[PDB]
Every structure is written in structure tokens, then in C-alpha cells.
Amino acid sequence: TDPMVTLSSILESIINDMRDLPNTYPFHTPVNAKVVKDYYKIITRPMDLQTLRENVRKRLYPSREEFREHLELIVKNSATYNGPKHSLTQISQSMLDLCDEKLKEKEDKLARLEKAINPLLDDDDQVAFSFILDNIVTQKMMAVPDSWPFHHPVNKKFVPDYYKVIVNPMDLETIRKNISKHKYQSRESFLDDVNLILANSVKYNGPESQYTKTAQEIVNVCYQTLTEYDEHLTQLEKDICTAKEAALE
Ligand SMILES: [C]SC1=NC(N2[C][C]O[C][C]2[C])=[C]C(C2([S+](=[N])(=[N])=O)[C][C]2)=N1
């Protein structure tokens, strides 16, 4: 029994339940951008239930977190385009609320499937490594003064030309989401994403901008803290690499 198949059946059943909620039809299929002519000038990451379902069938979601992140895009896009209190946004929120109810009902079964799909989710050294990285982001990097421009993805509605300049965006919330998915097995991949924040600031704001000085401070405190914990992090990375190669069945 392939655990990815079992997981995908669970996620598909949640989509069926969400589709059945009242007034949800505007979210069943992609927005038609030839009718909503300014949609892509406002929205960067379109999402809908049909695309979500086809992604499940493409086996793109190895865990509930990747699934839920795409589902939350439906709400975020509606809040941006239609408005935070618009009925469409309330409707989209009702779908996300139902998903969270179903995920909580099945949390123990989902945990077992997710660890069967990716054993590193159960590895104590991966969990400890990710916990340290998350604390560096929240306690050190997000605490840099005036670091707010880098905390969250840029909303195209408020910075309309941002993604015409920046094609590979990165922000601290996205890094935190990656940590919670245990995307990082060593400092190298983590530092690639951290440095993308700075590189994008140099490109969009310029090398001498106050925004870039803040991004430089964020990168520097990251290096400084990784150095302080270097002995511990090195042992974690070694033990993660051993566990990752033991997952060769
Ligand atoms: C001027 S408003 C703004 N500027 C931002 N940055 C990004 C870094 O370069 C400078 C400037 C373009 C970022 C944000 C976000 S937000 N969701 N509103 O759009 C909080 C994330 N707002």
C-alpha cells in the first residue's frame, strides 16, 4: 500500500467536502483572467479547488502542510482581490475552516502516512535542527529593527512592479514554512534562501538603500548565530545525513 496514494485519497475527500459548502462555486475553477482582466496584475499565485485536486492527483503534496498552504492561497487571494470582509472571502474561509477540522480529526493517521512517505519527519535530529533554525529566524532575524519588509511575501497589490523585477522571491515567513516542512537538512540550503532575501533587496531597492542595509543586518545576525551554535549544528547535520542515507531501502 503506497502511503502517497492513501494520503492523496484523504486530501481528495477534504476537497469534496469543501466543494459541498454553500456558495463555494466561484472557487471551484480557476479565475478567468480574460474576463477578470486585471486579475494577474493583482494576484501572483492563483489557486482554486480544481487545480488543488489536480495537484493532489499529480502527487505534489507529500504532507498536509503543502496541501494546506495552497488551500490558504485561495483565501489570501480573495482577501486581496475582493476584500478582507467580502462575502467571497468569508466563503473561502469557510473552506479553510472545514479543512482544518478534517485535518485535526485525522491528525494521527496523517502523521503516520507522512512519516512513511518521508522518514526524516520522524528523525529526532532533523526535528532538533529545524527547531534551532526556526528560533534563529524568529528570535534573531525577525528581531532586526525595521525588518518588516522581509517578514512576509510582497503583495503585488501594494507593490505592483515587484515581481516584474524580482522573479525568485523569498521572505522570512516562507523560510519558516520551509523549516516546518523540514526542507533544510543543512545550513547550506538554509543560507541559500536567506541570501536570496538580500540579493532581492539589492536588485529591487539598490545596494545603498536603507532597505538593503536592513537585509544585510538580517543576513549578518544569521551568520553570527549559526557560528555560535556551530558545534551543535555540525553534529546534527552529520546525524541527519546518516539518517537520510539509511532511508535507502
Ligand atoms: C512599501 S510596502 C512593502 N514593501 C515591502 N518591501 C520588500 C523589500 O523591498 C522593499 C519593499 C518593496 C514589503 C512589504 C510586505 S507586503 N505584504 N505589503 O506587501 C510586508 C511584506 N510591503
- Residue closest via CA to ligand 1's atom 6 equals 149
User: CA triplet 111, 113, 116: central angle to 5 degrees?
Assistant: 110
CATH number, domain of 52, equals: 1.20.920.10
User: Which SS3 state, helix, strand or coil, does residue 155 take?
Assistant: coil
Contacts of 199 (CB under 8 A, 6+ apart): none
Grid coordinates given for 151 = 517578514
Residues comprising the chain, all counted: 249
Tell which residue, 72, 67, 45, has the closest CA to residue 56: 67
Resolution (A): 1.6
Tracing cell 477540522 back to the chain, one arrives at: 101
Mutate to test the pocket of ligand 1, among 154, 166, 209, 213 (most ligand atoms within 8 A of CB): 154
User: Which runs of E-coded beta strand occur in 2-88?
Assistant: none
- Which of ligand 1's atoms lies nearest the C-alpha of 157? 19
Q: Running DSSP on this structure, what letter comes out for residue 22?
A: T
Ligand 1 binding site (Cβ under 6 Å of any ligand atom): 148-149, 152, 154-155, 158-159, 162, 201, 204-205, 211
Nearest CA to ligand 1 atom 1: 159
What is the Cα–Cα distance from 168 to 163, expressed in whole angstroms? 8
Q: With 0-12 CB in 10 A as exposed, 13-18 as middle and 19+ as buried, what is 163? A: middle
Which strand (E) or helix (H) includes residue 190? helix 187-205
The CA 116 to ligand 1 mean position distance, Å, reads 39
Which grid coordinates are listed for 174? 516562507
∠ Cα 42 198 171 (to 5°): 45
Q: How far apart are CA 241 and CA 142, in angstroms?
A: 29
The end-to-end CA distance of the chain, in Å, is 16
**Ligand 1: distance of its center to the CA of 22 in Å?**
35
> SS3 for 58?
coil
Rounded to whole angstroms, the Cα distance separating 42 from 45 reads 10
Q: CA distances (Å), 69 to each of 66, 96, 116, 117, 201, in order?
A: 5, 10, 21, 19, 25
Take atom 22 of ligand 1 and give the residue whose Cα is closest.
Answer: 149
> Which residues are CB-neighbours of 189 under 8 A, at least 6 positions away?
183
Separation of CA 111 and ligand 1 centre (Å): 35
Q: Tell me the best of 158, 171, 200 to mutate to test the pocket of ligand 1, counting ligand atoms within 8 Å of each CB and taking the most.
A: 158
Q: Nine-digit cell at 241?
A: 545525513
Indicate which residue's Cα is closest to atom 12 of ligand 1: 159
* Domain limits for position 110: 7-120
Q: Is 13 helix (H, G, I), strand (E, B) or coil?
A: helix
Backbone angles phi, psi at 67, to 5 degrees: -60, -50
Technique behind this structure?
A: X-ray
